[PDB]
Structures are given as structure tokens and as C-alpha cells.
A paper describes a structure:
Follicle-stimulating hormone receptor (FSHR), a G-protein coupled receptor, is an important drug target in the development of novel therapeutics for reproductive indications. The glycoprotein hormone receptors represent a subgroup of GPCRs, including receptors for three gonadotropins, follicle-stimulating hormone (FSH), luteinizing hormone, and chorionic gonadotropin, along with thyroid-stimulating hormone (TSH). The receptors possess a large N-terminal leucine-rich repeat-containing extracellular domain, which interacts with glycoprotein hormones (GPHs). The binding of GPHs to their respective receptors on target cells activates the Gs-cAMP-protein kinase A signaling pathway.
The atomic details of FSH bound to the entire extracellular domain of its receptor (FSHRED) has been reported. Surprisingly, the FSHRED formed a trimer, an unprecedented oligomer form for GPCRs, in the crystal structure. However, it was not clear from these data whether FSHR functions as a trimer in the native state. The trimer structure was crystallized from a PEG solution and determined in the P1 space group. To test whether trimer configuration depended on the particular crystallization condition, we crystallized and determined the complex structure in the P31 space group from a Jeffamine M-600 crystallization solution. The trimeric arrangements are almost identical in both structures, supporting the proposed FSHR constitutive trimer. The model is further supported by our crystallographic studies that reveal that the FSHR trimeric structural configuration is not dependent on the crystallization conditions and space groups (as in the cases of P1 and P31). The FSH residue Thrβ60, at the potential exosite of FSH, does not interact with its primary binding monomer but potentially interact with the neighboring monomer. Thrβ60 makes hydrophobic contacts with Val85 and Tyr110 of the neighboring FSHR. In our trimeric activation model, a constitutive FSHR trimer is only able to bind one fully glycosylated FSH molecule, in contrast to three deglycosylated FSH molecules binding to one FSHR trimer.
Author numbering:
A (entry chain X): 18 to 282, 291 to 294, 334 to 338, 342 to 356
B (entry chain B): 1 to 109
C (entry chain A): 5 to 92
Write the structure that this text describes.
Amino acid sequence: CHHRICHCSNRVFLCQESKVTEIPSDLPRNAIELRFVLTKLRVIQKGAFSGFGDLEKIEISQNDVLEVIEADVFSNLPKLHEIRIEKANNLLYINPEAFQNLPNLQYLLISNTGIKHLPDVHKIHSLQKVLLDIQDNINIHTIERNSFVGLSFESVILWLNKNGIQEIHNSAFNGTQLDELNLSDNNNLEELPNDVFHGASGPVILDISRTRIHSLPSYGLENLKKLRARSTYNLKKLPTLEKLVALMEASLTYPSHCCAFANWRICNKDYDLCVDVTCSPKPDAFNPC
Amino acid sequence: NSCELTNITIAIEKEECRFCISINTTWCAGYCYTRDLVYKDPARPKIQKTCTFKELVYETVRVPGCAHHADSLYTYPVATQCHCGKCDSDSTDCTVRGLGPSYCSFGEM
Amino acid sequence: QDCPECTLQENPLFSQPGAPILQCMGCCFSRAYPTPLRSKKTMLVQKNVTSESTCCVAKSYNRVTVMGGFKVENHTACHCSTCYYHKS
Ligand SMILES: *[C@@H]1O[C@H](CO)[C@@H](O)[C@H](O)[C@H]1NC(C)=O
Ligand SMILES: *[C@@H]1O[C@H](CO)[C@@H](O)[C@H](O)[C@H]1NC(C)=O
Ligand SMILES: *[C@@H]1O[C@H](CO)[C@@H](O)[C@H](O)[C@H]1NC(C)=O
Ligand SMILES: *[C@@H]1O[C@H](CO)[C@@H](O)[C@H](O)[C@H]1NC(C)=O
Ligand SMILES: *[C@@H]1O[C@H](CO)[C@@H](O)[C@H](O)[C@H]1NC(C)=O
């Protein structure tokens, strides 16, 4: 296979190097995979990847002159399950109309970009379980109300770790089925408001490791099974096992918290074929319990 | 399983002199066993290993100059131990494809 | 010592006689090397090491229900593709 500027092999198109300044008009509609690496793209044009009814994967990596993702860009793609927006140091803005109806989306990666805000996902409406993985985006400082509603009709995994988050609004997770939520390595994050988990299932897994979070909310943790709070020094007070009923594993900071989980606590049939809280740090060298 | 210390050739790019220098070093490459889970439970063990550095060291090499631009120093990491484990997102770029260890903006081998 | 390729195998837990459950499992190529400077120019957060990795995942499947009530996948095809759960 051969294209004017993009390298091609088995309906897979890799558009690499500085010679690539605009997304080619002559890209075959049958394309399965489309990659844009090391390009001198300044903007990804309004409705650029619309029409590729076969296209299942998109990659936008290592583009140092990309600044904006226009409206209607990720539209008319019934077969797309994966988008990867990686290493885009000058990408500051994403039009709240960029992510359109993507019914088979399974993975959205936004890593190491300069984006000032989270992506607008209310128009995705995927039929699939979605993994929204947003990491190393130091210019993202706030998760606003209803940030993930309409992303999926299915349960969702939300990796919002290693960004620059310091504010989380009430109901930020409303109208969402939260499977897993990772807020770790957002060091400036000082508090989890009480209505953070308002109108949201779960999460089953929560990671607040290496955060200045002082306390957990009174409700919303009724489904929490795994809590990861490594180097979460501002906590010190945890909810009672009457509130964390579902909790079965917990990797915390203070060994005093583990002592409280010990000494207190079937199904028809490595694998968990279905007993107490698997807590750490658990040292006996100093206790105190 | 078959993740081990392999010999590689890397490119050190002196942008100002419009060339790269080749340096044979030791890094990681090989195969790791993975399992795609059949039962998608939120508390399931969704964990995948990759072939990557277990421990590393930094090495400084003298990169030549040309004209109007003097010879500089460049520090690069070297694999010391490889393992099939988690990709350390803190230090590593955990991706599908990179530009290649011997990537140069001005040539090839 | 060797690493068998990513292919369909019978799931021990969910499989039953006459009705096995097929799962993608095996080995895929993954590597690591220092990040080229060209890449470092596009990274707002610097990463000195670069990991290129692929994982054993189902190319296609069919949602089924077994052992009274378990919504499990019966994998029909496998390939080494994108790793979603390999990072720390
Ligand atoms: C919560 O989400 C629903 C849609 O799922 C919406 O109708 C409602 O206004 C939202 N509530 C708040 C508090 O924003
Ligand atoms: C790597 O290269 C060095 C020097 O050429 C050699 O001693 C060594 O045997 C090679 N093999 C491995 C696996 O490191
Ligand atoms: C080291 O690099 C040279 C190129 O400079 C290459 O030809 C050779 O295979 C490498 N290994 C040894 C042991 O010289
Ligand atoms: C899984 O797929 C195999 C092959 O298509 C089939 O024989 C088997 O009946 C399926 N298992 C279930 C539980 O439907
Ligand atoms: C990363 O590499 C650069 C030089 O290439 C250096 O400034 C930095 O200290 C290295 N080490 C770490 C741990 O980032």
C-alpha cells in the first residue's frame, strides 16, 4: 500500500514527520487505523475524521505545534473504540463540541498535553464500558459539576491522576456509573466535598494517594471495596466500618487505621472465587494496638 | 517471561549542529504473558505487565560540537536489571509506539 | 523459559463440558529505551525513559451467561494490542 504523504500498510495509515502540516483530503475512507505522529499540525480541522465508517483507532502523538481540537472532529465514526491524544505540549484548548456521538468508544487517552480543562464528553453516549484515562495534564486544575454525564450508558473507569487538580465541584460525578476513580498524584487537591458522589453509582475502587485530602465523604462509599490512600497524610480520620461495609482491601498511610480494620468482619461455585479487610501498613514492630 | 537485558544503539541529537551520535548501550526488550479478562467485574484484577527497567543508572557522554557551537555533555539512563512489571508512569513514557531508540531528526544508520 | 504467543485458551473457572469459555492469553513484544530528544521537545512533563508495549487482548468476542448468572465474554479472536492497565 502507498499514499501521497502518509505511510500505509493493511488499511493502517501513519502520517509522520514535519512534511505533514494538514490532515490529507485524499485519505481512504476504508481506513482501519489512522496515526498522526511528529507532525507540524497547528489545528485538527472541523470534522476531519468524519466518514471513516470502518475506522476503529486514532493516534495523535508527539505534535509540538498542535494548539486546538475543533468542533465536530470526532463525529460519524460507528466503529471507533480507541483515541490516543499523547504528548501535545502546546495543545491548550478542546472545543466542547469535539467529541460527538461515539457509540463504540472504549478508551480515551489524553496524556501529557497542555489542556487547561477536561474534555467535554456529554455527547459521546457510548454503548461500551469506557476508560477515560487523563494523566500528566498539569494545566487541568478543576473537575466541574456533571463532568462525566452522558459519556456512557455503561459503567466507567476514571483515571484523573497526575494532573493539576485542586478543586472538585459538588455532583462532578452525577449521572455516572463509577467503577474506578483515580485522583492520585494531584498534590494541590485539598478536599473532597460531601456531595462529590451525588447521583453516581460507586466507585468500587478509589485512589486518593499522594493528595492533601483531609477527609472522605459521609455517603457514596457504600460500594467502595478497594481504597488506596498511600502518602495521604492529611486524612488521619476514616469512616467507621458501618459506612465502609463493602470495603474488603485498603492500602493506607497510618498503621493505626489498619488495627481498627482487624478483629472485626457463602457463595455457590489466581481468582477470588465469589475474607476480611486486606490492610497495609500492618506492622507489629511499634503498633500502637 | 522472556524479558532481558538486550544491547541497543541509541541516538543523541545535538539540535544546534544538525546531527546525532550513535552510542551502543544496554536496555530492555522481550516478551511478557498477559490475560484479557473474561469476567469484567469492577474489583477484578485488571493488571498487565510490560518488559521494562527494574533498576537503572545515568551515564554521561561527551557529545561533539561543530562550528560556532562547542562540544556539550549529555546524560542518559541505562538499564541495569529488566523485569516484566508495571510501567513506571512517573519516569517512563508508557505507550504503544515511540519514535525509536535510534531516532534522529537529521539521518539514520 | 520461552513465551507462548497470544492465543485463545480455555478458561478454567467459567469453562464447563460442552460449553467452554475461550480467553485471550499469551505473550506479546514489549520494550524500553531512553526517550529521543525529538520526543522530549513535545513532552510538557519530562519522561527520560520510553516504554513501547503491546498486550494480549480479544480482537472480538460474544457476551454469554453461565453458572446460574455470570455475564462473561467468550473470546473469538486474539491479538497483541494496546495496554490499558500496565501503568503505575
Ligand atoms: C444530574 O444528572 C441528571 C442527568 O443524569 C440531570 O438531569 C440533573 O440535572 C443533574 N443534577 C445536578 C445536580 O446537576
Ligand atoms: C552486550 O554487549 C556487550 C559488549 O559488546 C557484551 O559483553 C554482552 O555479551 C552483550 N550481550 C548482552 C545480553 O548484554
Ligand atoms: C557498537 O557500535 C558499533 C557502531 O559504532 C556497531 O557496529 C557494533 O555492532 C556495536 N557493538 C560492538 C561490540 O562494537
Ligand atoms: C463459547 O464458544 C465456543 C466456541 O464458539 C462454544 O463451543 C461454546 O459453546 C461457547 N460457550 C458458551 C458458554 O456459550
Ligand atoms: C532526565 O534527563 C535530563 C537530561 O536529559 C535531566 O535533567 C534529568 O535530571 C534526568 N533525570 C530525571 C530523574 O529526570
